[PDB]
Write a structure and sequence with these properties.
antimicrobial protein, antimicrobial peptide, globular, mainly alpha
């Protein structure tokens, strides 16, 4: 899988960030 920093770039661009990514990246 992709790194949590790279997943977060996509998550905040699409507007879909959730646990654990939301806690990890502070979305």
């Amino acid at each position: 899988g992709l790194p949590r920093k790279i997943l977060c770039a996509i998550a905040k661009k699409k507007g879909k960030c959730k646990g654990p990514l939301k806690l990890v990246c502070k979305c």
